[PDB]
């Protein structure tokens, strides 16, 4: 998960 | 927004839609080519290729469960193509990038048109 | 084998495929939650979700158009997952993480199962 | 594009  | 996102998301769901398409479920409609059947799904067919899109976006015929292509179609070009489709994997080589580029043409699949484009004019 | 892959292809396919649900074109179920519906493709929720695999592979299920989910599962917290679904980004607030959680649970979506269980010990 |  990333911060998009 | 304030939205996390998952980076292999995207790349997992056209595993699955490909993994669907492999055991033929939910399948709904099929592409004849020079007498040569492809089982595929209306929508995944309609977000790579701009052809299918005005096709299955056609009142008539987003109801048809057979979609006959131009007779100067090559079934390997479709084939590699629509595992393209399914997979982000073109199987480009020197003797089918003329088909290849052909039937991208034809289906409308840009991405794909300038790649080949691209390869043909480095062989030159 | 020798194939060139379209880094793009998977997340330019998602973006199409939410494109088609927002226009309604071509979406084949309706999901009903506490009488709030939600239109959507069953192979893109089959994609997804362990829970619609399970319901769309069934012989009598994968026939119906009406889908209607355990009355215990809150709208919102469907319509986050369902966004996700179609475009890996997750809507993910300390006023929704319990019901987000709850539902991906339900709906067998394990890798936002383990994001909301991280989220919530951090907090703890 | 690249070689997967
Ligand atoms: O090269 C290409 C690939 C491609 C895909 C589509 N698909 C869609 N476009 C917009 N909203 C939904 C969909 Cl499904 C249309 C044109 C082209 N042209
Ligand atoms: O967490 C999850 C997400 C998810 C998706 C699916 N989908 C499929 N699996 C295998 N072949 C085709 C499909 Cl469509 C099954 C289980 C789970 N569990
Ligand atoms: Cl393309
Ligand atoms: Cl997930």
């Known amino acids: 998960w990333v911060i998009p | 927004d304030s939205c996390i996102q998952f980076t292999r998301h995207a ?7 490909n993994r669907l398409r492999s055991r033929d479920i939910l399948t709904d409609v099929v592409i004849v ?5 492809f089982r595929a ?3 995944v067919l309609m977000a790579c290729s701009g052809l ?11 109801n048809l469960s057979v979609i006959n292509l131009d007779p100067e179609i090559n079934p390997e070009g479709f084939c590699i193509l ?3 489709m399914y997979t982000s994997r073109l199987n480009l080589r020197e003797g089918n990038i003329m088909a290849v ?5 034809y289906l409308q699949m840009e991405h794909v048109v300038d790649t080949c484009r691209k390869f043909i004019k480095a062989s030159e």
Chains 1, 4 share one sequence.
Do not use: G, P, W
């Open chain 2, 52 to 62: 299918f899109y005005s096709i299955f976006t056609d009142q008539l015929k987003c």
């Open chain 2, 101 to 105: 580029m052909a039937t991208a043409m």
């Open chain 2, 82 to 84: 629509l595992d393209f």
């Open chain 2, 41 to 43: 799904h209306k929508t």
């Open chain 2, 11 to 17: 790349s997992d769901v056209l595993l699955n839609l």
């Open chain 2, 33 to 37: 080519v020079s007498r040569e059947q």
